[PDB]
């Protein structure tokens, strides 16, 4: 809303104006990398026991 | 393996439903990455190329199609490596010809006649997805046709194609676009035949290969020497430089021309025979 | 000189203020002399210019 | 001249779930990041630091859709953030009167768990300031560069 | 999501996030302090255009073939093999800089 | 001064991988895009040439005769130019900037 | 005084700009130094010759 | 483009204040619908 | 699996010192010929010393010519007591990401393909001997394909001298020479058949119309700066226009129903495009990098995917 302030003539009178607006998000990441070893994968799985 | 293409906010009513009309229409994309602009697609990341730049970009950049088209992103599954894990997926013909089964596809500027998104104004670009053997001869074509505009012919407008004609011309925009191909292929020839010209008659060495030379250029090769001879002339001419900036060259075109496949088509459960305008079911994996 | 980008930009102030301190290279810093930047990355600066 | 960073900037809506303030209880109006070069500069002539440990929340906000709010995501197709109250007050309101100034929604959440936290806390003219370098806390040994 | 090279399987992690401006105005401000090292040196380098292209050249074989290796000969900055056509023009390495 | 306190120099002399270039005598682009829009028939006196007239003496009289009122039409663009100091040249009085 | 430092001398041509002595230098001529090089085999001495 | 009216029955009831006051149409390039009204007008019924 | 993994096993002898094991797993992508695509091998079927002739160690002309008689592996993993290698030929891995090592000076991009030439470069021509087994190991190096289109035709042009300077290029600003060296008579003339043989097939009916286009070249040239910069400061057509005034023959024998300029093409692509691909060999790899950055740097790996 916006307030007002009353003045005398001739100045055209002044009413209550409202703003209305609305805004819009936007949309964002991350990133980040675990890789593992190839024998790491075996000794987990247990194969190379 | 798919990757996402991420569209900005701010899509209008028309450009929305315009990504959604592009459904399994070719795109390339830069590297193989889990995300990525859409800026990176669309025709203003190629600086403006003309038939000759775009043959060149389609070369460094990593194809994909396009899978199911998410109102906030774009999926798009890669033909190098995501289609040897994925293994079929449909691809929409956009070319006048109809793709039979089991056809090597290749993907070919738009040169006979291009989605504007007003919202963000950028364009795409997509390409014309023709099997190799007509991609081969259009191209073919349109080059020859450069050079007899380069002084045409009743012929050669006309292509048949499984019964069908096909009209390249349906013109001067296309000339000149494809214009920068036609100077190096009038290069690379005459400057391949006159080293032809400057070498023969330099060695015609005799071991067995001028026996295997002029026993072949028996009224084949010197007679087509000698009425180029008759049709020219007979320092120290630089000829053995001239070689490696010509092979250099000549080695760089057949890779521009050549208009390799990705994609086999393996139909199953479907027609033979698939038409313009629909979807055919694609691979590259054997 | 170039017409096409002075022409096109917008001319709220608002705004301009707020890009010029954030906006994109021309050059690189990374090269051994000095280029047009390469497609891959991205140097916010401020041209005041 | 940091009197005229703080003063040129215009305080957005107050939400009264942060809290951030002082251990006297004074709240905190906002944040200056610089280098660590500049930091000392400051610290040592030109600004006093008001405070040392400072009170911070704990946990996030969470908005699930849960209840009612659901439905209407799969069935109407929208999602309102919290509708089990939007919904309940356009009922009452139905109803009463009129006030102009009323309970703001946002206002009735109960304040969230606060810890005691080490900031530097300086008094720029009128406002507290967390005066802050994060370039060894983050950006430490990883080769990212300063922003 | 999860993928794999040369035997080594990536674990690749993503959230997603979103960011609003809820004030009106300006909430923040930058403020420049103080300066580091210019980076770049200020030199004099002179700008050849015999990198370039796309201007006709001048009739005369002789004469351009003079110009060009009478000017982009020993030249900091101009083309050291003769430009190709479709590749991209380097500009010679420097042993080193200071 | 350098960046790192040189002093150096710049001259003349190393303009020339700029002006050197053929394409300063590149023209069409003007040429062809400035007559767009037609454009009136000045006073053509130093615009145009004939071929010599066959009488030694009667040539100059022929000229006087057929060019008086050619040079009473307006004035001659080239000469009126003449007085034209640096700061008047540049203002938009005289229309001969373009 | 002290131990008398060694004087040498180096012959130049006589056009040479005194303003190339009026900071820090080096007499040879041509900077020297690995410090100054790149990261290539042939650098070090392509400085120095 | 696509600038959907804000949706007055919520906004009927806010869940937090807006605290500074500034004329906002100066600038506006920072919002998507943006609305003046003089005192009142019909659409909002 | 053997569709995409068909992984061939060098085995490595008995005896090898420390300093001869450990510089195995320093070569951990590089690039072996295996002579057959079996799932055992041995280092005497891969090293250098397979790789000579009865008696004649071939020069670096020839030792190309007989990488394209074999199958190029890339090494995936060394284990102490074989070598693991995936062949290019089947098929690269399941996804299909290996890893190269670039031994060159020169870096990569993405997207180059990669093709792989003997050691030609100056202090470059690094092979690893293995002195508890004397066995030399002449690793390949690879290039991106508009180097090894160029080095080739240095190879080649410079033999061609010899029947009756040259080596020194650049590359993104780095000058780099390679080395010159001596070069057999044998290697040479099959390259020298290899053009000429392939060269006068690139000839056809339709190159008679062409050839009456070169005074229209020099006549463009001089307008344009692109052909300008197209045809060179050291061209032959500069000067097979001034000595050559062609004409071209007015009827042709059936010349309404065949084309003229289009023949030729053809028969020119089928021949003279593909010679760069007949005396090197063929790139069957280029490089993808995934979220890295777009070039990859010398001596850093490089992920590899395979390429038609």
Same mark, same amino acid.
Request: a negative charge; glycine letters at 6%; charged letters at 20%.
């Given at each position: ?49 | ?15 929305? %439903? ?12 830069? #590297? ?23 043959? *060149? ?8 199609v ?64 023709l ?6 001869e ?17 012929? /050669?407008?006309?292509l ?22 036609? /100077? ?8 391949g035949? #006159?080293?032809?010209?400057? /070498? ?10 001028? %026996?295997? *030379? ?69 691979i590259?994996?054997? | ?11 709220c ?8 301190? +954030?906006?994109? +290279?021309?050059?690189?810093?990374? +090269?051994?002399?000095?280029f ?14 | ?11 957005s ?21 610089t ?44 999602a ?10 356009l ?57 | ?5 040369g035997?080594?399987?990536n ?6 996030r ?13 403020? !420049? ?5 210019? @980076? !770049?040196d ?22 351009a ?6 000017? @982009? ?7 050291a093999?003769?430009?190709? @056509? ?13 | 001064?350098?960046?790192?306190? =040189? ?61 008086? =009122? ?29 | ?6 004087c ?38 392509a400085?120095?010759? | ?33 943006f ?11």
């Open positions: 809303h916006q307030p007002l302030i009353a003045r005398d003539g001739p100045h055209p009178v002044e009413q209550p104006v409202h703003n209305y607006m609305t805004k819009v998000i936007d949309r964002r990441a991350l990133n980040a990398a675990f890789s593992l070893a190839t024998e790491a994968i075996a000794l987990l799985t247990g194969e190379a026991l | 393996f798919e990757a996402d293409i991420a569209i900005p906010s701010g899509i209008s009513r028309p450009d929305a %439903a315009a990504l959604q009309r592009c459904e399994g229409r070719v795109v390339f994309l830069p #590297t193989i990455r889990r995300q990525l602009a859409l800026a990176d697609v669309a025709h203003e990341s190629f600086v403006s190329p003309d038939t000759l730049g775009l043959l *060149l970009a389609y070369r460094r950049r990593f194809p994909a396009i899978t199911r088209v998410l109102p906030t992103r774009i999926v798009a599954c890669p033909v190098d490596l995501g289609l040897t894990h994925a293994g079929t997926v449909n691809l929409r013909n956009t070319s006048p010809v109809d793709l039979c089964n089991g056809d090597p596809v290749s993907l070919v500027p738009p040169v006979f006649e291009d989605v504007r998104l007003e919202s963000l104004d950028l364009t795409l670009r997509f390409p014309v997805p099997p190799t053997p007509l991609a081969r259009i191209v073919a074509r349109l080059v020859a046709r450069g050079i007899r505009d380069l002084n045409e012919l009743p012929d /050669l407008n006309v048949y194609y499984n019964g069908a004609r096909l009209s390249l011309v349906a013109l001067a925009s296309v000339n000149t676009e494809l214009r920068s191909l036609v /100077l190096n292929m009038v290069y690379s020839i005459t400057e035949t #006159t080293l032809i010209l400057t /070498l023969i008659p330099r060695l015609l060495a005799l071991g067995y290969v001028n %026996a295997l *030379l002029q026993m072949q250029s028996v009224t084949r090769e010197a007679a087509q020497l000698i009425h180029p001879e008759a049709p020219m002339l007979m320092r120290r001419l630089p000829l053995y430089e001239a070689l490696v900036a010509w092979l250099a060259h000549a080695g760089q075109l057949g890779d521009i021309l050549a208009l390799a496949p990705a994609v086999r088509v393996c139909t199953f459960d479907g027609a033979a025979v698939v038409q313009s305008g629909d979807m055919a079911p694609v590259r994996y054997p | 000189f170039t017409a096409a980008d002075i022409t096109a930009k917008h001319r102030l608002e705004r301009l203020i707020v890009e010029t301190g +954030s906006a994109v +290279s021309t050059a690189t810093a990374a +090269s051994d002399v000095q047009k930047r390469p497609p891959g990355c991205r140097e916010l600066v401020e041209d005041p210019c | 001249w940091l009197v005229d960073l703080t003063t040129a900037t215009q305080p809506v107050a939400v009264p779930r942060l809290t951030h303030a002082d251990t006297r209880g004074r709240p905190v109006d906002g944040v200056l990041v280098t660590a070069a500049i930091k000392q500069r400051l610290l040592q002539s030109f600004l006093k630091v008001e405070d040392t440990e400072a009170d911070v929340p704990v946990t996030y906000g969470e908005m699930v859709l849960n209840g009612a709010n659901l439905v209407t995501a799969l069935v109407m197709g929208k309102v953030r919290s509708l089990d109250d939007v919904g309940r007050h009922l009452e309101m139905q109803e009463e009167q009129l006030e102009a100034n009323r309970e703001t929604l946002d206002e009735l959440e109960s304040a969230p768990q606060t810890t005691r936290v080490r900031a530097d806390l300086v008094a720029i003219g009128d406002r507290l300031v967390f005066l802050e370098a994060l370039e060894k806390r983050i950006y430490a040994a990883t080769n990212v560069p300063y922003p | 999501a999860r993928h794999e090279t035997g080594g399987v674990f690749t992690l993503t959230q997603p979103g960011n609003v401006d809820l004030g009106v105005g300006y909430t923040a401000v930058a403020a !420049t302090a103080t300066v580091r090292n210019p @980076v !770049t200020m030199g004099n380098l002179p700008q050849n255009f015999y990198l370039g292209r796309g201007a006709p050249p001048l009739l005369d074989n002789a004469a073939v003079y110009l060009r290796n009478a000017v @982009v000969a020993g030249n900091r900055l101009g083309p093999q003769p430009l190709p @056509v479709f590749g991209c023009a380097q500009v010679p390495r420097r042993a080193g800089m200071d | 001064w350098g960046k790192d306190h =040189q002093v150096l120099r710049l001259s003349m002399e190393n303009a020339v991988g700029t002006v050197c270039h053929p394409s300063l005598m590149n023209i069409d682009a003007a040429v062809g895009g400035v007559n767009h829009d037609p454009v009136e028939a000045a006073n053509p006196y130093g615009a145009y040439v004939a071929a010599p007239a066959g009488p030694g003496a009667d040539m100059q009289q022929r000229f006087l005769n057929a060019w008086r =009122q050619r040079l009473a039409h307006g004035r001659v663009r080239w000469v009126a130019e003449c007085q034209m100091t640096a700061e008047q040249f540049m203002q938009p009085d005289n229309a001969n900037l373009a | 005084h002290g131990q008398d430092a060694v040498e001398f180096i012959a130049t041509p006589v056009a040479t700009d005194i303003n190339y002595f009026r900071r820090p230098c080096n007499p040879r001529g041509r900077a020297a130094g690995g410090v100054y090089a790149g990261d290539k085999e042939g650098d070090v001495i400085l120095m010759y | 483009r696509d600038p959907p009216g804000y949706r007055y029955a919520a906004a009927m009831v806010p869940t937090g204040s807006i605290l500074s006051t500034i004329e906002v149409a100066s600038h506006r390039r920072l919002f998507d619908f609305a003046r009204v003089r005192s009142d007008e019909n659409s909002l019924y």
